Amino acid sequence: MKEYTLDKAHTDVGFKIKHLQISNVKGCFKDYSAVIDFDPASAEFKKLDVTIKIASVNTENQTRDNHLQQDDFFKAKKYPDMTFTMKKYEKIDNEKGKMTGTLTIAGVSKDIVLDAEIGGVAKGKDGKEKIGFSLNGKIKRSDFKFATSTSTITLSDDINLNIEVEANEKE
Amino acid sequence: MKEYTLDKAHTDVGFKIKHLQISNVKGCFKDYSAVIDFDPASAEFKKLDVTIKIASVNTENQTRDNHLQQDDFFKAKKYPDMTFTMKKYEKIDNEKGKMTGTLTIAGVSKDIVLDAEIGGVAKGKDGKEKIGFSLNGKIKRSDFKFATSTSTITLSDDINLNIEVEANEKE
Amino acid sequence: MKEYTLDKAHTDVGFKIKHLQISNVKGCFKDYSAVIDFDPASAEFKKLDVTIKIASVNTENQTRDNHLQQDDFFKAKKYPDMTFTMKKYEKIDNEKGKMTGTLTIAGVSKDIVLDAEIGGVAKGKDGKEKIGFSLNGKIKRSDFKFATSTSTITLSDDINLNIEVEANEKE
Amino acid sequence: MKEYTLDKAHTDVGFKIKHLQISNVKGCFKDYSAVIDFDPASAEFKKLDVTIKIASVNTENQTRDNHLQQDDFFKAKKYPDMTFTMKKYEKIDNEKGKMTGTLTIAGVSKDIVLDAEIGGVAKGKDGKEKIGFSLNGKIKRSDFKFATSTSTITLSDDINLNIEVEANEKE
Numbered sequence: 001m002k003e004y005t006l007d008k009a010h011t012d013v014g015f016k017i018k019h020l021q022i023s024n025v026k027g028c029f030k031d032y033s034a035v036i037d038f039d040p041a042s043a044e045f046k047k048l049d050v051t052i053k054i055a056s057v058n059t060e061n062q063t064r065d066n067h068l069q070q071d072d073f074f075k076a077k078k079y080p081d082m083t084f085t086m087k088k089y090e091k092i093d094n095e096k097g098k099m100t101g102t103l104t105i106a107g108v109s110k111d112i113v114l115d116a117e118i119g120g121v122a123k124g125k126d127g128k129e130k131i132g133f134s135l136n137g138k139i140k141r142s143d144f145k146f147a148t149s150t151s152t153i154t155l156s157d158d159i160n161l162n163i164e165v166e167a168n169e170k171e
Numbered sequence: 172m173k174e175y176t177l178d179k180a181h182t183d184v185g186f187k188i189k190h191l192q193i194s195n196v197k198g199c200f201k202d203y204s205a206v207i208d209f210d211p212a213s214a215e216f217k218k219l220d221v222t223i224k225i226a227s228v229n230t231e232n233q234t235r236d237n238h239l240q241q242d243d244f245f246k247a248k249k250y251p252d253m254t255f256t257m258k259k260y261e262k263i264d265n266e267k268g269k270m271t272g273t274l275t276i277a278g279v280s281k282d283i284v285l286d287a288e289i290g291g292v293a294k295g296k297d298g299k300e301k302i303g304f305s306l307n308g309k310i311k312r313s314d315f316k317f318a319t320s321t322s323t324i325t326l327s328d329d330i331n332l333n334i335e336v337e338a339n340e341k342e
Numbered sequence: 343m344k345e346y347t348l349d350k351a352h353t354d355v356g357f358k359i360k361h362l363q364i365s366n367v368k369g370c371f372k373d374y375s376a377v378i379d380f381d382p383a384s385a386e387f388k389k390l391d392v393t394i395k396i397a398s399v400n401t402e403n404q405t406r407d408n409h410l411q412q413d414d415f416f417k418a419k420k421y422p423d424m425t426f427t428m429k430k431y432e433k434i435d436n437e438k439g440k441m442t443g444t445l446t447i448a449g450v451s452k453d454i455v456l457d458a459e460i461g462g463v464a465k466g467k468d469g470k471e472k473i474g475f476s477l478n479g480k481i482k483r484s485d486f487k488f489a490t491s492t493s494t495i496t497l498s499d500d501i502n503l504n505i506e507v508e509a510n511e512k513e
Numbered sequence: 514m515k516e517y518t519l520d521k522a523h524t525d526v527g528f529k530i531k532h533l534q535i536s537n538v539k540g541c542f543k544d545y546s547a548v549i550d551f552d553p554a555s556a557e558f559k560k561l562d563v564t565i566k567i568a569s570v571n572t573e574n575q576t577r578d579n580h581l582q583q584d585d586f587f588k589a590k591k592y593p594d595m596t597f598t599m600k601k602y603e604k605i606d607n608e609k610g611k612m613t614g615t616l617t618i619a620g621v622s623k624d625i626v627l628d629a630e631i632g633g634v635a636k637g638k639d640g641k642e643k644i645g646f647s648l649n650g651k652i653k654r655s656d657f658k659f660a661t662s663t664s665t666i667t668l669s670d671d672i673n674l675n676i677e678v679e680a681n682e683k684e
């Protein structure tokens with residue numbers, strides 16, 4: 001037998017423990033188009049039709065964006081775009097109204113409600129109109145059979161839509 | 172009614188979705204002491220007794236370390252230190268053996284097994300001995316009623332011990 | 343050395359693996375009171391004030407119900423009741439409207455919106471009025487600093503309110 | 514305006530909230546074969562070779578068992594069986610020893626250690642030998658690239674092996 005003293009300099013009294021962390025993935029699309037018909041006399045939307053290029057997704061990360069395009073997500077090869085079609089705008093007042101439309105994600109379509117909040121209506125510098133509104137609402141992954149392989153535990157079943165728009169009159 | 176065109180520059184077609192992420196918290200203790208009796212003739216440990224100052228924890232983060240000291244973790248005010256006491260070393264060969272001892276965390280004591288792996292035995296530059304071994308093993312939070320408030324979901328019930336030691340002869 | 347044959351009858355080739363499962367806790371309250379002023383000429387609510395006895399919770403399980411009363415949940419000793427006070431009803435049509443009111447849980451108050459859906463308005467058998475409506479909406483635990491000890495991982499931050507009411511005229 | 518009183522009999526003041534629950538899946542295999550060479554003079558294993566029919570899995574549930582056979586698990590069509598081959602038994606004493614062998618799951622092979630605990634050695638009623646031992650150890654899903662599609666969050670990366678054997682001498 002013999003006696004030793006630790007060399008604290010090259011000794012590590014260590015442990016590893018596994019924990020979970022919840023975080024929001026925030027994201028948008030760089031490439032989309034829309035048709036907007038709005039009546040500032042009454043603060044009513046008349047037609048709102050949006051097409052989004054799935055390809056142009058951005059969640060501030062280069063490799064997860066590619067993965068979104070694959071079979072277990074968007075399947076962008078087969079279904080390159082997602083679309084929203086307004087069916088009904090029910091005004092609450094000049095600032096607020098309930099929008100109902102058809103959302104289509106990878107060929108599956110469901111009718112959703114978004115909360116329209118009008119942030120500002122104006123006649124601009126040049127005497128031509130502008131508006132700044134938002135559309136907000138929660139859709140369920142399950143309702144669109146979207147990313148069915150991924151469990152509702154790992155990734156929430158709820159997606160929260162926040163569409164923030166500035167827009168000017170045409171021609 | 173009137174027609175608008177989005178100003179893509181001040182429009183954001185956005186979404187938020189919640190996901191979970193699993194990660195290892197790695198950590199050690201900066202301040203501990205040990206008594207080590209080892210016989211290089213036979214590669215057997217004779218006595219190994221460690222005292223760790225809970226206060227000196229480090230998981231590479233200043234604020235979680237403080238939180239570890241609180242009631243729902245270490246309770247360092249009441250139980251400032253954790254201790255290991257070897258009871259039995261069962262040699263497998265010169266590189267490997269099974270160590271059995273008493274671990275005490277916040278006043279609760281249980282007998283654990285660690286896997287001893289001898290990385291190197293030597294007579295040094297100056298003709299005095301050295302050794303470099305490791306002790307590895309999994310303990311269960313539940314076995315020590317440790318952090319009972321925190322669910323086995325958020326934080327694993329398993330803690331993985333990795334004690335890496337370099338040490339030299341005494342006097 | 344010697345050769346053996348398993349007795350399949352008293353041999354078990356076994357394994358254990360840990361998995362997570364997501365489930366809805368559904369619940370209601372057995373004991374509450376309300377004041378309801380409604381105008382069937384216009385399908386508008388005028389006053390809606392509810393008081394719920396936290397004590398009377400029921401999630402189909404005797405022991406979790408008790409636990410709900412404790413400090414890390416309702417604190418029913420200090421805050422025996424939760425209250426809702428209508429501030430504003432904004433009609434959409436005769437079937438649908440947006441209700442805004444003050445919810446109070448354990449002394450913390452916040453203004454919420456519920457979606458009112460009128461399932462049926464009637465003059466009854468005896469020529470006295472009835473109505474059957476629902477109130478639906480999502481509140482956030484975090485908004486009320488409710489059950490702060492429990493992580494948003496183990497238990498959702500979102501509570502989904504579904505108030506289903508049948509009601510008859512007074513005196 | 515008009516005043517109503519709830520019909521408590523057909524009124525439900527209700528809520529739904531999502532929570533996670535951790536549970537052990539326990540399981541075994543009904544159909545396997547083994548070759549066992551053991552020396553009761555020294556309490557050493559000499560040869561231990563097991564073949565397990567993946568098909569015969571049982572986790573007390575008819576539909577999850579089928580799912581285990583599919584591509585995202587065992588792929589039983591391609592890889593019908595899992596095998597263990599002992600390479601080395603290192604005795605600790607007559608009750609305990611460390612077993613090292615090759616585990617193969619769906620064509621991927623890795624060397625594992627199991628803790629052998631001898632529960633009983635005997636010469637039976639009829640003067641022929643018996644033994645009753647157990648083999649215990651943790652393997653990692655990731656080490657065998659097993660069920661790669663399923664996240665380490667939903668299902669633990671750790672599988673815990675508990676092989677409980679009774680066995681009698683041959684011919």
Ligand SMILES: *Sc1ccc([N+](=O)[O-])c(C(=O)O)c1
Nearest residue numbers: 026027028058059060185186
């Ligand atoms: S367009 C856009 C890019 C990145 C992010 N993001 O922060 O990950 C957003 C967003 O917050 O919606 C939008």
Ligand SMILES: *Sc1ccc([N+](=O)[O-])c(C(=O)O)c1
Nearest residue numbers: 014015197198199229230231
């Ligand atoms: S002593 C020490 C400090 C920090 C870390 N760490 O990486 O968080 C370790 C470790 O990896 O064990 C040790």
Ligand SMILES: *Sc1ccc([N+](=O)[O-])c(C(=O)O)c1
Nearest residue numbers: 368369370400401402527528
């Ligand atoms: S009042 C009531 C009791 C039990 C349940 N439950 O199913 O757990 C409910 C509900 O579904 O809302 C209501």
Ligand SMILES: *Sc1ccc([N+](=O)[O-])c(C(=O)O)c1
Nearest residue numbers: 356357539540541571572573
């Ligand atoms: S062979 C066998 C069948 C069922 C179970 N089970 O309880 O799910 C076991 C086990 O506990 O190992 C074994």
